[PDB]
RNA sequence: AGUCCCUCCCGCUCGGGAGGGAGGCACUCUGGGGGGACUGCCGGCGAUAAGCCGGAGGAAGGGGCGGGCGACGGUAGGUCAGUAUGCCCCGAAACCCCCGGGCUACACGCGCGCUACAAUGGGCGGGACAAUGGGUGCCGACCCCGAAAGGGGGAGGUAAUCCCCUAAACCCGCCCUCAGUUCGGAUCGCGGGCUGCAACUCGCCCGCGUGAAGCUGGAAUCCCUAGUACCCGCGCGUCAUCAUCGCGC
RNA sequence: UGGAGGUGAUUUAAAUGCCAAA
């Protein structure tokens, strides 16, 4: 199936997974600019040394952040698209090899379908899927109310990544589509502001609810 | 339609029902009222030097102790 | 070039293809009806699994000799699904391994060290190393970094 | 909480007054002096005492 | 005839590496490094060599013996040993400075180990506990 | 690991490997002793005190990380069915033995779990990498017989020497393609075995056959802050035989 | 330091005490 040249691939430059360069990737949003790490790096696997320190996740390559985000089950204690998705034993939790392969194949599909650098498309997707205003809850007379507040950039990035991962997880659940194809489809849809993307619709709903309660 | 960037210059304190909200002072970087300093409520971790994207620049948070 | 210079599975495939020319290697008469261990569930699907198993055993003896039946039984075991009970590890059977070793000895590729097990003869070592060299010659045309080794 | 212990302070003050001209603002010198001038056996307690003595020396030299 | 030996440790995996003048051949327990699988493990070992440069890479031979741990633990110990052997063999501080910028752990190691388990559902972990019921 | 000798392989050997013997304590390891971190250094806040916040260097930074040790008392909390013990009872039975039953029953309510409801998979062939512990009423390599479970001999070991002991999740190739199915494996029929004085009530293992509910779960509610949680197997205790458990790795 | 007065306000719903001590 897979050619031997791909099974035994030897890199010679410091670039993401030995296949893509992030030299020409630019971040349009001024707020997310210092929180999307794009430094040159070959292997995106830091062995979880960043979670100890405050704001430590800022200097972690974005591809590894995506890999960590999809390394989960997906629907444990809340419903996504109206269903619990409890993978359990068959879940991808604690298997970083499989998540790495899924991300690699998704990037290949994205590059084939659009002809652009996959990291650029990922950056566009997270830029379009990050909300700008949220709400917090108050209690009065046994009734719950909302009050509009602003979001810090790091939380924006976290929410965007989680929503992309959840949409990809929901698309491949008990259907004929595979995980890599679902991830590529979700990223491409989110990059074009298409309402069929789970993340973009979620962002629109969040901002609408926040606006209607100023 | 795209909001206005603002820069955080001071941290005041935590607030909210469960201590989830922080009150900060920001300076507008762009738009009609560029250069003005107003206070705002923020959800999520934040530090001096961050940049927020406000959707409107006329609402000011009530001062907390 | 030696056995250490090539991936294991490709070498096993090539050796299995080559072993069909040796008259002393023949599947037993009960071969078409058995499983390869109590932890399996269905019969082997390849019509020539016997040669694959024999080639694997030969390469195993090359690398870890001397070795006996019990340790090989440990090697070919695996995890078993037990219905409503949790999965567990189990060993394999003995007849297949013993018959394969006896046939290999009859072919002159291995010999018996008393009280210790079975080891690879010079003839078998040459037989394996020649195929390994051929495979490496084929392989380095597409991976230029292998020319150094 | 890095709160100094009472007996550490007491022994450090006793040592400082007994030999005022024996300790400097260097941690190693005070460590050796504390090792030789008492019967302390724990390496941790020795370090605590030496550190507090160093602080006392630099505080009195400054004149409070 | 220079011979240099270095050691690397990572969560019960121990690697011993020997470096000398050569043609660029690197072997892990006798296997060429270009055939290590899976890919994520192969790239872990190759990073110090790629950082050093091709001229240095083709001028030395390295042989590593590693035991203990798992398939990912063994790769990291080999990586540490190779990095230390490289910085010692060439003995230039520009390369040592470059390694610290890219990954500090290449030279200082990783001291993390497992935490011993405790009662109340001991087999699962030191902190995981049995589900609690009231009625 | 370097050095020497012998034997065997490959591209026929410039070069590259594997065993064995000499030889060595370099490296790993084992275990005695010692060093190392003290808010010690630098900048702020506080009072100039007690301290707090942030940096350098460092394997390690602010109880460095994980454990043992639980004050005066209370809870008429649990235990006289572990042992010790007052009073009351039985004292030819309520004491001591032997045989057969029961604690394993079954319209139903509840606790903690295991296996699943499939592709973030099922099957078949092939390829990789551990640690803690235990062994003479015992662990048993190695050879032979058998399709399997098992059977007949039997080296070494009172153990850093011999054995349990070549883990699984993971990777490569082929079949299945969203279906109550090549998902799930409850229930039942026939046959073959082991332990034991005894296997029906009432044990565990293997082969062929059969093929139940289940297609993600209402109101509610539990655990967890880093080598932690999730996922994956292994060791010991109990033990003639029997682990969906406890304690550990 | 410690006291005495005055004016304002004060975000849904939320009843009961068996068994035993005897
Ligand atoms: Mg296997
Ligand atoms: Mg299963
Ligand atoms: Mg653990
Ligand atoms: Mg009581
Ligand atoms: Mg009972
Ligand atoms: Mg099935
Ligand atoms: Mg019965
Ligand atoms: Mg279904």
- Six-digit token string for A140: 């009065």
Q: What total of structural domains would you count in chain D?
A: 1
Residue D44: strand pairing partners: none
CB-based contacts of E60, cutoff 8 Å, min separation 6: E19, E20, E21, E22, E24, E89
Whole-number Å distance between alpha carbons of A111 and A187: 12
- Six-digit token string for A143: 């009734």
CA of E119 to the centre of ligand 5 (A): 25
Name the residue closest to the C1' of F177 by its CA.
Answer: A176
Q: Is A45 on the interface with E (CB under 8 A)?
A: yes
Supply the range of the domain harboring residue B53. 1-65
For residues B45 and B30, is the Cβ–Cβ distance under 8 A?
Answer: no
Q: What total of structural domains would you count in chain E?
A: 1
Among D37, D41, D51, CA closest to D8: D51
State, as a whole number of angstroms, the distance between the CA of A183 and the C1' of F226.
29
Nucleotide nearest to A54 (CA to C1'): F225
Torsion sign across C-alpha atoms A42, A44, A49, A52: positive
Whole-angstrom CA distances from A63 to A36, A37, A41, A44, E57 are 10, 9, 10, 7, 28
Residue A148: strand pairing partners: A135
Whole-number Å distance between alpha carbons of A170 and A82: 10
CA of C41 to the centre of ligand 6 (A): 9
Which of B8, B38, B55, B60 to mutate to test binding with chain A, by most A CBs within 10 Å of its CB? B55
In a domain, D54, yes or no: yes
Q: What is the DSSP string of chain C?
A: --GGGS-HHHHHHHHHHHGGG-TT----TTGGG--SSTT--S---STTHHHHHHHHHHHHHHHH-SB-HHHHHHHT-EEEEETTEEEEEE---SHHHHHHHHHHHHTTSEEEETTTEEEE-HHHHHHHHHHHHHHHHHHTTT-GGGG--
Domains (range + CATH), chain A? 4-212 (1.10.455.10)
C chain contacts of residue E31, beta-carbon cutoff 8 Å: 4-5
CB-based contacts of C143, cutoff 8 Å, min separation 6: A4, A5, A8, A10, E34
In a domain, D20, yes or no: yes
CATH of the domain at D50: 1.10.60.20
Nucleotide nearest to A139 (CA to C1'): G11
Q: Is E54 on the interface with A (CB under 8 A)?
A: yes
Whole-angstrom CA distances from C132 to A9, C136, C137, E30 are 21, 6, 9, 15
Q: Is B48 on the interface with A (CB under 8 A)?
A: no
The subunits that touch chain C, with at least 3 C-beta pairs less than 8 Å apart, are A, E
CA of A190 to the centre of ligand 3 (A): 39
Q: Do A4 and C145 touch (CB under 8 A)?
A: no
Q: Is B26 on the interface with A (CB under 8 A)?
A: no
Q: Do C and D count as touching (3 or more CB pairs closer than 8 A)?
A: no
Supply the range of the domain harboring residue E132. 1-135
Task: Work out the burial of residue B55: count CB atoms within 10 Å of its CB; fewer than 13 is exposed, 13-18 middle, 19 or more buried.
Answer: middle
Supply the range of the domain harboring residue D50. 6-62
Q: Is A15 on the interface with E (CB under 8 A)?
A: no
Q: Is E40 on the interface with A (CB under 8 A)?
A: yes
Strand F bases within 7 angstroms of protein beta carbons: 1-3, 8-11, 16-18, 26-29, 35-41, 48-52, 59-60, 62-63, 65-67, 110-131, 140-150, 155, 164-174, 177-178, 184-186, 206-208, 215-218, 221-235, 244-249
Whole-number Å distance between alpha carbons of C69 and E92: 54
Nearest bound ligand to CA C81?
Answer: 2
Give the closest of C4, C145, C148 to E31, CB-based.
C4
CB atoms within 10 A of CB E88: 13
SS3 E127: coil
Side-chain-side CA neighbours of B49 within 13 Å: the count stands at: 4
Whole-number Å distance between alpha carbons of A89 and C39: 20
Say if strands A83-85 and A75-80 run parallel, antiparallel, or are unpaired.
antiparallel
Name the residue closest to the C1' of F10 by its CA.
Answer: C1
Torsion sign across C-alpha atoms D39, D41, D45, D51: positive
Whole-number Å distance between alpha carbons of A203 and B56: 18
Whole-number Å distance between alpha carbons of A103 and A70: 9
In a domain, D1, yes or no: no
Whole-number Å distance between alpha carbons of E100 and E94: 10
Q: What total of structural domains would you count in chain B?
A: 1
Resolution (A): 2.6
Strand G bases within 7 angstroms of protein beta carbons: 11-13
Residue A146: strand pairing partners: A137
Whole-number Å distance between alpha carbons of E77 and E70: 11
Whole-number Å distance between alpha carbons of A181 and A185: 6
The subunits that touch chain A, with at least 3 C-beta pairs less than 8 Å apart, are B, C, E
CB atoms within 10 A of CB C24: 13
For residues C9 and E37, is the Cβ–Cβ distance under 8 A?
Answer: no
A chain contacts of residue C142, beta-carbon cutoff 8 Å: 4-5
């Amino acid at each position: 199936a897979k050619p031997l040249s791909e099974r035994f691939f030897i890199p010679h430059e410091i670039k993401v997974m030995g296949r893509w360069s992030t030299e020409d990737v630019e971040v349009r949003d001024p707020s997310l600019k210092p929180y999307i790490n794009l430094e040159p790096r070959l292997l995106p696997h830091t062995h979880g040394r960043h979670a100890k320190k405050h704001f430590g996740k800022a200097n972690v390559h974005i591809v590894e952040r995506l890999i960590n985000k999809i390394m989960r089950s997906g629907g444990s204690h809340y419903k996504v698209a109206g269903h619990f998705m409890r993978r359990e034993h068959r879940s991808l939790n604690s298997k970083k090899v499989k998540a790495y392969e899924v991300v690699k194949e998704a990037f290949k599909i994205i590059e084939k379908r659009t002809g652009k650098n996959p990291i650029q498309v990922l950056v566009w997707a997270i830029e379009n899927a990050a909300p700008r205003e949220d709400t917090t809850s108050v209690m009065f007379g046994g009734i719950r109310y909302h009050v509009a507040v602003d979001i810090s950039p790091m939380r924006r990035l976290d929410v965007a990544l989680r929503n992309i991962a959840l949409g990809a997880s929901a698309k491949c659940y008990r259907t004929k589509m595979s995980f890599a194809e679902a991830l590529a489809e979700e990223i491409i849809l989110a990059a074009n502001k298409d309402p069929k993307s789970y993340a973009y619709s979620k962002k629109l709903e969040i901002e609408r609810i926040a606006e209607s309660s100023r | 339609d795209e909001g206005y960037p603002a820069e955080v210059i001071e941290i005041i304190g935590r607030t909210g029902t469960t201590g989830d909200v922080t009150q900060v002072k920001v300076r507008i970087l762009e738009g009609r009222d560029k250069g003005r300093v107003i206070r705002r409520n923020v959800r999520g971790p934040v530090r001096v030097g961050d940049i927020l994207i406000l959707r409107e620049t006329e609402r000011e948070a009530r001062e907390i102790k | 070039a030696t056995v250490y210079d090539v991936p294991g599975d490709l070498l096993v495939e090539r050796v299995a293809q080559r072993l069909k020319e040796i008259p002393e290697i023949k599947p037993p008469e009960w071969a078409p009806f058995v499983k390869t261990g109590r932890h399996k569930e269905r019969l082997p699907e390849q019509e020539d699994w016997w040669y694959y198993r024999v080639a694997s055993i030969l390469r195993r003896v090359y690398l870890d000799g001397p070795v006996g039946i019990e340790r090989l039984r440990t090697y070919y075991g695996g995890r078993k699904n037990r219905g409503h009970a949790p999965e567990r590890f189990y060993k394999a059977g003995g007849s297949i391994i013993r018959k394969a070793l006896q046939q290999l000895e009859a072919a002159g590729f291995v010999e018996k060290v008393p009280g210790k097990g079975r080891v690879i003869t010079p003839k078998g070592r040459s037989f394996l190393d020649k195929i390994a060299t051929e495979l490496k010659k084929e392989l380095e045309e597409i991976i230029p970094e292998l020319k150094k080794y | 909480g890095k709160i100094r212990q009472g007996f550490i302070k007491r022994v450090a003050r006793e040592l400082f007054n007994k030999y005022p001209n024996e300790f400097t603002r260097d941690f190693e010198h005070n460590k050796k002096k504390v090792e030789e001038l008492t019967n302390v056996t724990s390496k941790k307690i020795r370090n605590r005492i030496a550190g507090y003595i160093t602080k006392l020396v630099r505080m009195k030299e400054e004149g409070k | 005839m220079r011979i240099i030996q270095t050691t690397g440790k990572r969560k019960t995996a121990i690697a011993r590496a020997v470096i000398r003048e050569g043609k660029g051949r690197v072997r892990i327990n006798g296997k060429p490094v270009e055939l290590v699988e899976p890919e994520i493990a192969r790239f872990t070992i190759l990073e110090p060599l790629i950082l050093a440069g091709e001229e240095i890479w083709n001028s030395v031979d390295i042989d590593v013996k590693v035991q203990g741990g798992g398939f990912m633990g063994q790769a990291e110990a080999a990586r540490i040993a190779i990095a230390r052997a490289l910085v010692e063999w060439t003995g230039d501080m520009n390369l040592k400075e470059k390694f610290i910028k890219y990954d500090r752990t290449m030279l200082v190691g990783d001291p993390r180990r497992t935490e011993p388990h405790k009662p109340n559902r001991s087999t699962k972990g030191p902190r995981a506990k049995r589900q609690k019921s009231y009625r």
